[PDB]
Write a protein that binds this DNA or RNA. Structure first.
Ligand SMILES: Nc1nc2c(ncn2[C@H]2C[C@H](O)[C@@H](COP(=O)(O)OP(=O)(O)OP(=O)(O)O)O2)c(=O)[nH]1
Ligand SMILES: [Ca+2]
Ligand SMILES: [Ca+2]
Ligand SMILES: [Ca+2]
Length: 341
DNA sequence: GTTGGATGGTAGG
DNA sequence: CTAACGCTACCATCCAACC
């Protein structure tokens, strides 16, 4: 088969610039103000202008504003952005029907039936790039491979604003060359676990017995790599099924007091149930971010579905349960619904 | 023991 | 208040209850 992974470039920022052309060419940091103090927040993302100075997603604003104070600091609007993503998705659905929407800014089409070889595959790659450009004035990165995984690595190499194929000549090359941290699904804990065993490339994993591999990075991780390294990896594109919908929010100051904490919780619950839409969940989870940034979960499942009124009375139970079993304060709190019908 | 739950980890550049 | 927002998938661990 043939997969055509597609990730939009510096998404949220590039939407702001589509809506505000004067921003083009300047640094633009899309932010997430928590309003605990002035400019308490986080950078959601920043255009490649601003990245050159090291303002990258995840860092604090106040720190970003050091690095670049004169850059254009816009606030995150998730709803403006989804609408776009949604519009762009329905263009991608012109080309293939089999489309998997991995994230807010990326998808895999299975263009197997639509093309006979990479040449054509790529040519469609250029076609997508252009329509999205003419229709939505956004620039994307196309990545093409025989499977999902190499599709992704392809477009890691490619981005920004680039198309990039990985034929077999290649795949088999990278299996004995590409360093193992570049394999998606392989973070840092895995990075260390693997270096310990002297495993730096996919090729290393069929010169080592399965059974140790399992007892060091887990079974599920092992088999996958082994598969990839044998190049027998066939894990097909298939429609998303949102398995959970959550929301967690930040408090003006940290707290242990239920009266202090409740109004925030209830906001997330309202916002969560609205996200849900038609879906009915079997399980709730109150989630806490502690003062020193541990993440603390408490949940329950029900045999039957969870009404909104159930969710309110229940969340508070769990929140007390949290307050009980850990003595720390709370920076953020929220809920996460799961196990739909 | 054999699942399906409860809690946490790792990763998503 | 003094830095760390926001979102989801999936796997591993401990463990409690039916074959
Ligand atoms: N709130 C928040 N949003 C994020 C975070 N990371 C990513 N996002 C949102 C904003 C991004 O524009 C979008 C997609 O992220 P990507 O991984 O694809 O990178 P991005 O789109 O910013 O540009 P990319 O080509 O890497 O350069 O998702 C994060 O840490 N926090
Ligand atoms: Ca992107
Ligand atoms: Ca992405
Ligand atoms: Ca990695």
């Amino acid at each position: 088969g043939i997969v055509l992974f597609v990730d939009f470039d510096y998404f949220y920022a590039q939407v702001e610039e589509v809506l505000n052309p004067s921003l083009k060419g300047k640094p633009v940091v899309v932010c997430v103000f928590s309003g605990r103090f002035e400019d308490s927040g986080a950078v959601a993302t920043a255009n490649y202008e601003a990245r050159k100075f090291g303002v990258k997603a995840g860092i604090p604003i106040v720190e970003a504003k050091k690095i670049l104070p004169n850059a254009v600091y816009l606030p995150m609007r998730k709803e403006v952005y989804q609408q776009v993503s949604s519009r762009i998705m329905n263009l991608l659905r012109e080309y293939s029907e089999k489309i998997e929407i991995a994230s807010i800014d990326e998808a895999y089409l299975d263009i197997s039936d639509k093309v006979r070889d990479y040449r054509e595959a790529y040519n469609l790659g250029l076609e997508i790039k252009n329509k999205i450009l003419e229709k939505e004035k956004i620039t994307v990165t196309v990545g093409i491979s025989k499977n999902k995984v190499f599709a992704k690595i392809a477009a890691d190499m490619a981005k920004p604003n680039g198309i990039k194929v990985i034929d077999d000549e290649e795949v088999k090359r990278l299996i004995r060359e590409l360093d193992i941290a570049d394999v998606p699904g392989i973070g840092n804990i895995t990075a260390e676990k693997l270096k310990k065993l002297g495993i730096n490339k996919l090729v290393d994993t069929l010169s080592i017995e399965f059974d140790k591999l399992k007892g060091m990075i887990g079974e599920a991780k092992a088999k996958y790599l082994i598969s990839l390294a044998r190049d027998e990896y066939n894990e097909p594109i298939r429609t998303r099924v949102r398995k959970s919908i959550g929301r967690i929010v930040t408090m003006k100051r940290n707290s242990r007091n239920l009266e202090e904490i409740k109004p925030y919780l209830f906001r997330a619950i309202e916002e969560s149930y609205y996200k849900l839409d038609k879906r009915i969940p079997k399980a709730i989870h109150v989630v806490a971010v502690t003062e020193d940034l541990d993440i603390v979960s408490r949940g329950r499942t029900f045999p039957h579905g969870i009404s909104k009124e159930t969710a309110y009375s229940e969340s508070v139970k769990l929140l007390q349960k949290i307050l009980e079993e850990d003595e720390r304060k709370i920076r953020r709190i929220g809920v996460r619904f799961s196990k739909f019908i």
